Coordinates of C-alpha atoms and ligand atoms in Angstrom, one line a residue:
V30 CA 24.1 -17.5 6.9
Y31 CA 24.1 -14.5 4.5
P32 CA 25.6 -14.7 1.0
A33 CA 29.0 -13.1 0.2
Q34 CA 27.5 -11.5 -2.9
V35 CA 24.3 -11.8 -5.1
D36 CA 23.4 -9.9 -8.3
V37 CA 20.2 -8.2 -6.9
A38 CA 19.5 -7.4 -3.3
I39 CA 16.0 -6.3 -2.3
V40 CA 15.2 -4.8 1.1
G41 CA 11.5 -5.1 1.9
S42 CA 9.1 -8.0 1.3
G43 CA 5.8 -6.3 0.6
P44 CA 4.2 -6.2 -2.9
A45 CA 6.9 -3.8 -4.2
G46 CA 10.0 -5.8 -3.3
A47 CA 8.0 -9.0 -4.2
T48 CA 7.3 -7.4 -7.7
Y49 CA 11.0 -7.1 -8.3
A50 CA 11.6 -10.6 -7.2
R51 CA 8.9 -12.1 -9.4
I52 CA 9.7 -10.1 -12.5
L53 CA 13.4 -11.1 -12.2
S54 CA 12.4 -14.7 -11.6
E55 CA 10.5 -14.5 -14.9
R56 CA 12.8 -12.4 -17.2
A57 CA 16.2 -13.0 -15.4
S58 CA 16.1 -16.5 -14.1
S59 CA 19.9 -16.7 -14.2
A60 CA 20.3 -13.9 -11.7
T61 CA 20.8 -14.5 -8.0
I62 CA 18.5 -12.5 -5.7
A63 CA 18.5 -12.0 -2.0
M64 CA 15.6 -10.4 -0.2
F65 CA 16.0 -9.0 3.3
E66 CA 13.0 -8.3 5.6
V67 CA 13.4 -7.1 9.2
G68 CA 10.1 -8.5 10.4
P69 CA 9.3 -12.2 11.2
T70 CA 7.5 -14.6 9.0
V71 CA 4.0 -14.7 10.4
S72 CA 2.1 -16.7 7.8
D73 CA 2.3 -19.7 5.4
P74 CA 3.4 -19.4 2.6
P75 CA 5.6 -16.4 3.7
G76 CA 3.8 -13.1 3.1
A77 CA 0.3 -14.7 3.1
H78 CA -2.6 -12.7 4.6
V79 CA -3.2 -13.3 8.3
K80 CA -6.8 -14.2 7.5
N81 CA -5.4 -17.4 6.1
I82 CA -4.9 -18.4 9.8
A83 CA -7.9 -20.3 11.2
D84 CA -7.1 -20.3 14.9
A85 CA -8.0 -17.0 16.5
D86 CA -5.1 -17.1 19.0
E87 CA -2.6 -17.8 16.3
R88 CA -4.1 -15.1 14.0
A89 CA -3.9 -12.5 16.8
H90 CA -0.4 -13.6 17.4
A91 CA 0.6 -13.1 13.8
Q92 CA -0.8 -9.6 14.0
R93 CA 1.1 -8.8 17.3
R94 CA 4.3 -10.2 15.8
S95 CA 4.0 -7.7 12.9
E96 CA 3.9 -4.7 15.2
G97 CA 7.5 -3.5 15.3
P98 CA 10.6 -3.3 17.5
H99 CA 8.6 -3.6 20.7
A100 CA 6.6 -6.8 20.0
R101 CA 8.5 -9.7 21.6
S102 CA -2.1 5.9 24.7
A103 CA -5.8 5.0 24.1
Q104 CA -6.6 8.1 22.0
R105 CA -3.8 7.4 19.3
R106 CA -4.2 3.7 18.4
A107 CA -2.8 1.5 15.6
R108 CA -4.9 -1.2 13.8
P109 CA -3.8 -4.8 14.6
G110 CA -0.8 -5.8 12.5
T111 CA 0.6 -2.2 12.4
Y112 CA 2.4 0.2 14.7
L113 CA 2.6 4.0 15.0
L114 CA 5.5 6.4 15.5
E115 CA 6.1 6.9 19.2
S116 CA 7.1 10.5 18.6
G117 CA 8.0 12.8 15.8
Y118 CA 4.7 12.4 14.1
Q119 CA 3.8 16.1 14.5
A120 CA 5.8 19.4 14.7
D121 CA 4.8 22.5 16.6
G122 CA 1.8 24.2 15.0
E123 CA 1.4 21.6 12.2
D124 CA -1.2 19.0 11.4
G125 CA 1.3 16.2 11.3
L126 CA 0.4 12.6 10.5
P127 CA -0.6 11.4 14.0
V128 CA -1.5 7.8 13.0
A129 CA 1.2 7.3 10.3
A130 CA 1.7 3.5 10.6
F131 CA 4.0 0.6 9.6
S132 CA 4.1 -3.2 9.4
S133 CA 7.2 -5.3 10.1
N134 CA 6.7 -8.8 8.7
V135 CA 7.2 -11.0 5.7
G136 CA 4.5 -9.7 3.3
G137 CA 4.7 -6.1 4.7
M138 CA 1.4 -4.3 5.1
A139 CA -0.2 -6.5 2.5
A140 CA -0.3 -9.3 5.1
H141 CA -3.0 -7.1 6.7
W142 CA -4.6 -5.0 3.9
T143 CA -8.1 -5.0 2.4
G144 CA -6.9 -5.5 -1.2
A145 CA -8.6 -2.8 -3.2
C146 CA -6.8 -2.1 -6.5
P147 CA -8.3 0.7 -8.6
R148 CA -6.4 2.2 -11.6
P149 CA -5.5 5.9 -11.4
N150 CA -7.8 8.3 -13.4
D151 CA -7.4 11.8 -14.9
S152 CA -4.8 13.9 -13.0
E153 CA -3.7 11.0 -10.8
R154 CA -2.1 9.4 -13.8
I155 CA 1.6 9.8 -14.4
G156 CA 1.5 11.6 -17.7
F157 CA 4.9 10.8 -19.2
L158 CA 4.0 7.2 -18.7
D159 CA 0.5 7.5 -20.0
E160 CA 1.5 9.2 -23.2
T161 CA 3.5 6.2 -24.5
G162 CA 0.8 3.7 -23.6
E163 CA 3.2 2.1 -21.2
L164 CA 1.1 3.0 -18.1
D165 CA -1.8 0.8 -19.2
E166 CA 0.6 -2.2 -19.9
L167 CA 2.3 -1.7 -16.5
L168 CA -1.1 -1.6 -14.7
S169 CA -2.2 -4.8 -16.5
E170 CA 1.0 -6.5 -15.4
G171 CA 0.4 -5.4 -11.8
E172 CA -3.1 -6.7 -11.9
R173 CA -1.6 -10.0 -13.1
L174 CA 1.0 -9.9 -10.3
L175 CA -1.7 -9.4 -7.6
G176 CA -4.3 -11.7 -9.2
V177 CA -6.8 -8.8 -9.2
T178 CA -10.4 -9.6 -9.9
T179 CA -13.7 -7.8 -9.9
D180 CA -16.0 -10.9 -9.8
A181 CA -15.1 -12.5 -6.5
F182 CA -18.5 -11.5 -4.9
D183 CA -20.7 -11.9 -8.0
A184 CA -22.4 -15.1 -6.7
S185 CA -23.6 -13.7 -3.3
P186 CA -27.3 -13.0 -2.8
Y187 CA -26.5 -9.3 -2.2
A188 CA -24.5 -9.0 -5.4
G189 CA -25.2 -5.7 -7.2
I190 CA -27.5 -4.0 -4.7
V191 CA -25.0 -1.3 -3.8
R192 CA -23.9 -0.7 -7.3
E193 CA -27.5 -0.5 -8.5
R194 CA -28.5 2.1 -5.8
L195 CA -25.4 4.2 -6.5
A196 CA -25.8 4.1 -10.3
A197 CA -29.4 5.4 -9.8
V198 CA -28.0 8.7 -8.5
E199 CA -24.9 8.9 -10.6
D200 CA -24.6 11.7 -13.2
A201 CA -25.4 10.6 -16.7
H202 CA -22.4 12.5 -17.8
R203 CA -19.8 10.0 -16.6
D204 CA -18.4 7.4 -19.0
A205 CA -17.3 3.8 -18.4
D206 CA -13.9 4.5 -16.7
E207 CA -15.8 6.7 -14.3
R208 CA -19.2 5.1 -13.5
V209 CA -20.0 3.1 -10.4
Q210 CA -18.6 -0.4 -10.8
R211 CA -17.1 -3.3 -8.9
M212 CA -13.9 -2.7 -7.0
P213 CA -11.0 -4.6 -8.6
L214 CA -9.7 -6.6 -5.7
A215 CA -6.4 -8.4 -4.9
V216 CA -8.2 -11.6 -3.7
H217 CA -8.3 -15.3 -4.4
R218 CA -10.0 -18.5 -3.3
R219 CA -8.2 -21.0 -1.1
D220 CA -8.1 -24.5 -2.6
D221 CA -10.4 -25.5 0.3
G222 CA -13.0 -22.8 -0.6
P223 CA -12.7 -19.5 1.3
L224 CA -12.1 -16.1 -0.4
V225 CA -9.1 -14.2 1.1
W226 CA -6.9 -11.2 0.4
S227 CA -3.8 -11.7 -1.9
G228 CA -0.4 -10.3 -0.9
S229 CA 3.4 -11.0 -1.3
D230 CA 2.5 -14.7 -1.3
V231 CA 0.7 -14.1 -4.6
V232 CA 3.2 -11.6 -6.1
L233 CA 6.2 -13.8 -5.2
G234 CA 4.2 -16.8 -6.6
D235 CA 5.4 -20.3 -7.2
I236 CA 7.9 -19.0 -9.7
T237 CA 9.8 -17.1 -7.0
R238 CA 9.3 -19.7 -4.3
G239 CA 10.7 -22.3 -6.7
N240 CA 13.6 -20.2 -8.0
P241 CA 16.9 -21.8 -6.7
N242 CA 18.6 -18.4 -7.3
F243 CA 16.2 -16.6 -4.9
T244 CA 16.5 -16.4 -1.1
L245 CA 14.4 -14.7 1.6
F246 CA 16.0 -13.7 4.9
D247 CA 13.4 -12.6 7.4
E248 CA 14.4 -10.9 10.7
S249 CA 17.2 -9.2 8.7
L250 CA 17.6 -5.5 9.1
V251 CA 19.3 -3.5 6.4
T252 CA 21.1 -0.6 8.1
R253 CA 23.1 0.7 5.1
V254 CA 23.2 0.7 1.3
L255 CA 26.9 0.2 0.4
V256 CA 28.0 2.7 -2.2
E257 CA 31.3 2.2 -4.0
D258 CA 33.0 3.9 -7.0
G259 CA 29.8 6.0 -7.6
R260 CA 27.5 2.9 -7.9
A261 CA 25.3 1.0 -5.6
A262 CA 27.6 -1.8 -4.2
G263 CA 25.6 -3.8 -1.6
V264 CA 23.8 -3.8 1.7
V265 CA 24.7 -4.1 5.4
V266 CA 22.5 -6.7 7.0
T267 CA 22.1 -7.3 10.7
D268 CA 20.6 -10.6 11.8
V269 CA 17.9 -9.4 14.3
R270 CA 18.2 -12.6 16.3
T271 CA 22.0 -12.7 16.9
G272 CA 22.9 -9.1 16.2
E273 CA 25.8 -9.8 13.8
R274 CA 26.3 -7.5 10.9
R275 CA 27.5 -8.7 7.5
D276 CA 28.0 -7.0 4.1
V277 CA 26.3 -8.5 1.1
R278 CA 27.8 -7.3 -2.2
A279 CA 25.4 -6.6 -5.1
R280 CA 25.4 -4.8 -8.5
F281 CA 21.7 -3.9 -7.9
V282 CA 20.0 -2.7 -4.8
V283 CA 16.2 -2.2 -4.7
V284 CA 14.9 -0.5 -1.6
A285 CA 11.2 -1.2 -1.1
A286 CA 10.9 -0.4 2.6
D287 CA 7.6 1.6 2.4
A288 CA 7.4 5.4 1.8
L289 CA 9.1 6.4 5.1
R290 CA 11.6 3.7 5.9
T291 CA 13.0 3.8 2.3
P292 CA 14.1 7.5 2.7
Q293 CA 15.3 6.5 6.2
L294 CA 17.6 3.9 4.8
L295 CA 18.9 6.2 2.0
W296 CA 19.5 9.0 4.5
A297 CA 21.4 6.6 6.8
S298 CA 23.5 5.5 3.8
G299 CA 24.5 9.1 2.9
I300 CA 22.3 9.1 -0.3
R301 CA 20.5 12.4 0.1
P302 CA 19.1 14.0 -3.0
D303 CA 17.2 17.2 -2.2
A304 CA 13.8 15.5 -2.9
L305 CA 14.5 12.7 -0.5
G306 CA 11.6 12.4 2.0
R307 CA 10.0 15.6 0.6
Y308 CA 6.6 15.9 -1.2
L309 CA 5.2 13.4 1.2
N310 CA 1.4 13.0 0.9
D311 CA -1.3 11.1 2.8
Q312 CA -4.9 10.8 1.6
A313 CA -7.3 12.4 4.0
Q314 CA -10.0 9.7 4.7
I315 CA -13.7 10.3 5.4
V316 CA -15.8 7.4 6.6
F317 CA -19.5 6.8 7.0
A318 CA -21.7 3.8 7.8
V319 CA -25.2 3.0 6.6
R320 CA -27.9 0.4 7.2
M321 CA -29.1 -0.8 3.8
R322 CA -32.9 -0.5 3.3
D323 CA -35.2 -3.0 1.4
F324 CA -33.0 -5.9 2.3
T325 CA -34.4 -9.3 1.4
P326 CA -33.0 -11.5 4.1
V327 CA -31.3 -14.8 3.2
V328 CA -33.1 -17.9 4.6
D329 CA -30.0 -20.0 5.2
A330 CA -27.0 -17.8 5.7
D331 CA -23.6 -19.6 6.0
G332 CA -22.3 -18.1 9.2
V333 CA -18.9 -16.2 9.0
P334 CA -16.1 -18.6 7.8
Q335 CA -13.2 -19.4 10.0
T336 CA -10.7 -18.3 7.4
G337 CA -11.2 -15.7 4.7
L338 CA -14.1 -13.4 4.1
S339 CA -17.8 -13.5 4.2
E340 CA -19.8 -12.9 1.0
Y341 CA -22.3 -10.1 1.5
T342 CA -22.3 -6.9 -0.6
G343 CA -18.7 -6.9 -1.6
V344 CA -16.8 -3.8 -2.5
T345 CA -18.0 -1.1 -4.9
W346 CA -15.8 1.6 -6.5
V347 CA -16.8 5.2 -7.0
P348 CA -14.1 6.4 -9.3
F349 CA -12.0 9.6 -9.0
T350 CA -12.5 12.3 -11.7
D351 CA -10.9 15.7 -12.0
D352 CA -14.3 17.2 -11.6
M353 CA -15.2 15.0 -8.5
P354 CA -11.7 14.5 -7.0
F355 CA -12.4 11.7 -4.4
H356 CA -11.8 8.0 -4.6
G357 CA -14.8 6.3 -3.1
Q358 CA -15.3 2.8 -1.9
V359 CA -18.4 1.1 -0.4
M360 CA -17.6 -2.1 1.6
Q361 CA -19.0 -4.9 3.5
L362 CA -17.5 -4.5 7.0
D363 CA -15.0 -7.4 6.9
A364 CA -13.4 -5.6 3.9
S365 CA -13.1 -2.2 5.4
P366 CA -9.7 -1.0 6.6
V367 CA -11.2 0.8 9.5
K368 CA -13.6 -0.5 12.1
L369 CA -16.7 1.6 11.3
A370 CA -19.5 -0.3 13.0
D371 CA -20.7 -3.8 14.1
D372 CA -22.8 -5.8 11.7
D373 CA -26.4 -6.4 12.9
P374 CA -26.5 -10.1 13.9
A375 CA -30.3 -10.0 13.2
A376 CA -29.5 -9.1 9.5
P377 CA -25.9 -10.0 8.5
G378 CA -24.6 -7.9 5.6
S379 CA -27.1 -5.0 6.0
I380 CA -24.6 -2.5 7.6
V381 CA -22.1 -1.2 5.0
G382 CA -19.1 1.2 5.3
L383 CA -18.1 4.0 3.0
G384 CA -14.7 5.6 2.6
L385 CA -13.9 8.7 0.6
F386 CA -10.2 9.7 0.0
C387 CA -8.9 13.1 -1.0
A388 CA -5.9 14.0 -3.1
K389 CA -3.3 16.1 -1.3
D390 CA -2.2 19.6 -2.2
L391 CA 1.4 18.7 -2.7
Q392 CA 4.0 20.7 -0.8
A393 CA 7.8 20.8 -0.6
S394 CA 7.6 21.2 3.2
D395 CA 5.4 18.1 3.6
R396 CA 8.2 15.7 4.3
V397 CA 9.9 13.1 6.6
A398 CA 13.1 14.3 8.1
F399 CA 15.7 12.4 10.0
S400 CA 17.9 12.9 13.1
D401 CA 21.6 12.7 13.3
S402 CA 21.5 11.5 16.9
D403 CA 18.2 9.9 17.8
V404 CA 17.2 6.5 16.6
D405 CA 14.0 4.4 16.4
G406 CA 13.5 0.9 17.9
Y407 CA 15.6 -0.6 15.1
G408 CA 18.5 1.9 15.6
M409 CA 17.7 3.7 12.4
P410 CA 17.7 7.5 12.3
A411 CA 14.5 8.7 14.0
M412 CA 11.8 10.4 11.9
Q413 CA 10.2 13.8 12.3
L414 CA 7.1 14.3 10.2
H415 CA 6.3 17.7 8.8
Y416 CA 2.8 18.0 7.4
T417 CA 0.3 20.9 6.9
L418 CA -3.1 21.0 5.4
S419 CA -3.5 23.9 3.0
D420 CA -6.8 25.8 2.5
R421 CA -7.2 23.7 -0.7
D422 CA -6.9 20.6 1.4
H423 CA -9.7 21.8 3.7
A424 CA -11.9 22.8 0.8
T425 CA -11.6 19.4 -0.8
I426 CA -12.2 17.6 2.5
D427 CA -15.4 19.6 3.0
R428 CA -16.5 18.5 -0.5
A429 CA -15.7 14.9 0.4
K430 CA -17.9 15.1 3.5
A431 CA -20.9 16.3 1.6
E432 CA -20.4 13.7 -1.2
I433 CA -20.0 10.8 1.2
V434 CA -23.3 11.7 2.9
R435 CA -25.0 11.9 -0.5
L436 CA -23.7 8.5 -1.6
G437 CA -24.6 6.8 1.7
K438 CA -28.2 8.1 1.8
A439 CA -28.6 6.6 -1.7
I440 CA -27.9 3.2 -0.2
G441 CA -29.6 3.2 3.2
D442 CA -30.2 5.0 6.5
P443 CA -27.0 6.4 7.9
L444 CA -25.9 5.2 11.3
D445 CA -24.9 8.8 12.1
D446 CA -26.1 11.9 10.3
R447 CA -22.5 13.1 9.7
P448 CA -19.4 11.4 8.5
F449 CA -16.0 11.3 10.3
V450 CA -12.7 12.7 9.1
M451 CA -10.1 10.1 10.2
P452 CA -6.8 11.4 11.8
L453 CA -4.1 12.2 9.2
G454 CA -2.1 9.1 8.2
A455 CA -5.2 6.9 8.7
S456 CA -5.3 6.1 4.9
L457 CA -1.9 4.2 5.2
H458 CA -1.4 5.5 1.6
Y459 CA 1.9 7.5 1.8
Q460 CA 3.2 8.7 -1.6
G461 CA 5.8 11.0 -3.0
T462 CA 8.8 10.7 -0.7
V463 CA 11.0 9.1 -3.4
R464 CA 9.1 10.3 -6.5
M465 CA 10.0 9.5 -10.0
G466 CA 10.5 12.3 -12.5
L467 CA 11.5 12.7 -16.1
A468 CA 14.8 14.5 -15.4
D469 CA 17.4 15.0 -12.6
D470 CA 16.2 18.5 -11.8
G471 CA 16.0 18.4 -8.0
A472 CA 12.2 17.7 -7.9
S473 CA 12.4 13.9 -8.0
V474 CA 14.4 11.1 -6.4
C475 CA 14.4 8.6 -9.3
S476 CA 14.0 8.1 -13.0
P477 CA 11.0 6.6 -14.7
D478 CA 12.9 3.3 -14.4
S479 CA 12.9 4.0 -10.6
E480 CA 16.7 4.4 -10.5
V481 CA 17.7 7.2 -8.1
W482 CA 19.5 10.1 -9.6
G483 CA 23.2 10.1 -8.7
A484 CA 23.3 6.5 -7.3
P485 CA 23.2 4.3 -10.4
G486 CA 22.2 0.7 -9.6
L487 CA 20.1 1.9 -6.6
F488 CA 16.4 1.5 -7.1
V489 CA 13.3 2.5 -5.1
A490 CA 9.9 0.9 -5.1
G491 CA 6.4 1.4 -3.6
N492 CA 3.9 4.1 -3.0
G493 CA 6.7 6.5 -2.3
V494 CA 7.6 6.5 -6.1
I495 CA 4.2 8.0 -7.1
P496 CA 4.9 11.6 -8.0
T497 CA 1.4 12.8 -8.7
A498 CA -1.5 13.9 -6.4
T499 CA -3.7 10.8 -6.1
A500 CA -6.8 9.7 -4.2
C501 CA -7.1 6.0 -5.1
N502 CA -5.5 3.1 -3.3
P503 CA -1.8 3.3 -4.4
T504 CA -0.5 -0.3 -4.2
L505 CA -1.5 -1.4 -7.8
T506 CA 0.3 1.7 -9.1
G507 CA 3.4 1.2 -7.0
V508 CA 3.6 -2.4 -8.2
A509 CA 3.2 -1.2 -11.8
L510 CA 6.2 1.2 -11.4
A511 CA 8.0 -1.7 -9.8
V512 CA 7.3 -3.8 -13.0
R513 CA 9.0 -1.2 -15.1
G514 CA 12.0 -1.0 -12.7
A515 CA 12.5 -4.8 -12.5
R516 CA 12.2 -5.1 -16.3
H517 CA 15.0 -2.5 -16.6
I518 CA 17.2 -4.4 -14.2
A519 CA 16.5 -7.6 -16.3
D520 CA 17.5 -5.6 -19.4
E521 CA 20.7 -4.6 -17.7
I522 CA 21.5 -8.1 -16.5
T523 CA 20.9 -9.8 -19.8
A524 CA 23.0 -7.0 -21.4
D525 CA 25.8 -7.7 -18.9
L526 CA 26.8 -10.7 -21.0
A527 CA 29.0 -8.1 -22.9
Ligands
FAD607 C1 -5.6 -2.6 7.2 C2 -5.0 -2.1 5.8 C3 -5.8 -2.0 4.7 C4 -5.3 -1.6 3.5 N1 -6.1 -1.5 2.4 C5 -5.5 -1.2 1.2 C6 -6.3 -1.2 0.0 O1 -7.5 -1.5 0.0 N2 -5.7 -0.8 -1.2 C7 -4.3 -0.5 -1.3 O2 -3.8 -0.2 -2.3 N3 -3.6 -0.5 -0.1 C8 -4.2 -0.8 1.1 N4 -3.4 -0.8 2.2 C9 -2.0 -0.4 2.0 C10 -1.1 -1.4 1.4 O3 -0.9 -2.5 2.4 C11 0.3 -0.7 1.1 O4 0.1 0.3 0.1 C12 1.3 -1.8 0.5 O5 1.5 -2.8 1.4 C13 2.6 -1.1 0.1 O6 3.6 -2.1 -0.2 P1 5.2 -1.9 -0.1 O7 6.0 -3.1 -0.3 O8 5.5 -0.7 -0.9 O9 5.6 -1.6 1.5 P2 5.1 -2.5 2.7 O10 3.8 -3.1 2.4 O11 5.2 -1.6 4.0 O12 6.3 -3.5 2.9 C14 7.6 -3.0 3.2 C15 8.4 -4.0 4.0 O13 9.8 -3.4 4.1 C16 10.3 -3.9 5.4 N5 11.5 -3.1 5.8 C17 11.4 -1.8 5.9 N6 12.6 -1.3 6.3 C18 13.4 -2.3 6.4 C19 14.7 -2.4 6.7 N7 15.3 -1.2 7.0 N8 15.4 -3.6 6.7 C20 14.7 -4.7 6.3 N9 13.4 -4.6 6.0 C21 12.7 -3.5 6.0 C22 9.1 -3.7 6.2 O14 9.2 -4.4 7.5 C23 7.9 -4.2 5.4 O15 7.7 -5.6 5.6 C24 -3.9 -1.3 3.4 C25 -3.1 -1.4 4.5 C26 -3.6 -1.9 5.7 C27 -2.7 -2.0 7.0

């Protein structure tokens, strides 16, 4: 049932592919757009967060259906809704990324995420985009695409307690962009009431869902980018249910398949610039849990809602600075990406999690490589992950450990006297494998318009495009770069009237 040809073909249905779809439905409403996603549709509207599902059985089922090719080792475990590499996650003598993870479903990982959307600060910021002022406009556009808000928790009885206690011990030398503040969150209220995380449902929006020139094929594996006469020419799509392959022609191909499957697809298609898969970076994650002190109990608590989130302390943001190079977030437990502790039923909302994230010392040898012979559960070239912590990595991680204890003691009594360094890959923030650069000099995969050097008309999208060393949650930034790329494709299409 696939089209013979469309104008733009998008592989991937998380916020990056969705960003391209929505921006072209806005600025290029005349263009036909096909989106191919290998995973099933597990939520309504497609791409919506699993916490929209009220029945616990159905919700657990949506999660299990997102967990990869085998979905129809107790010491190396994936969070629900994601799956790990079965092998190739670590080479001899290397740290590797033991819990590098993926999601395969409409909505991508954003059907399962915890929605935190900070802006990059200081050296995390892409400078050639920051100098023109365009970076701020792109980040504003991404906040619009994700419906990002800071106020979602401002009415709860515990509003501001965590922010107050942190501000008490925060250096009087930081300015507004750097002081303790609310986390900006990709969250919205359901018409029936409950707060819930926002994903590709929100990025796609009613403008994409109502666009008669747009189509979404779930359970559709892209095995190849068709290149012809120098340019991107289309995609090869396998219907996962019947197994038949078909070519879809396209003047534009956007690959937003996450930071490791996007290089996978490009390698399988013979598009192999030297930077492809290289400069891969995860954000080492340190976690901590504390019981808040001096906690006025609420006389008539609501009892956890059957969809969406509870409203306890919310999420606070402790911003990255060059001088203090960790992204910090303090979270009520149902907003943490990692199970840290159980809430006290005697005092709901009093146990809070903390996570600090480090910036990686970027290395050429930190990469994802691919096999000529072996294949994964989708029949795509199998990955081998090469990843080493430098001494600078270890030094900054030790700093993060001391700082997370200092921040947690300011809030309450720690559940443990020392924090925990999560296994590498646990942050689920993988950047750099298809990084943008100013010039085709071998050190980048794509241009500032996200177009890959040497394959005009081929575009890349997601956290893999971020070329800098970052600590903060990357999705907002990946979506912002997607905004620039999709605007460029719209420019090209409207100009095609020549
Ligand atoms: C529990 C959890 C908590 C998180 N918390 C945060 C947070 O607070 N802040 C933040 O910024 N991020 C967070 N993240 C990470 C966030 O989900 C990702 O950064 C974001 O989803 C990246 O979007 P993407 O579209 O680039 O890739 P993805 O979200 O992975 O989507 C890519 C899609 O491409 C599809 N695809 C891949 N290959 C093919 C193919 N070959 N053919 C067809 N389809 C293909 C995949 O199946 C997937 O659906 C969290 C993630 C999880 C799991």
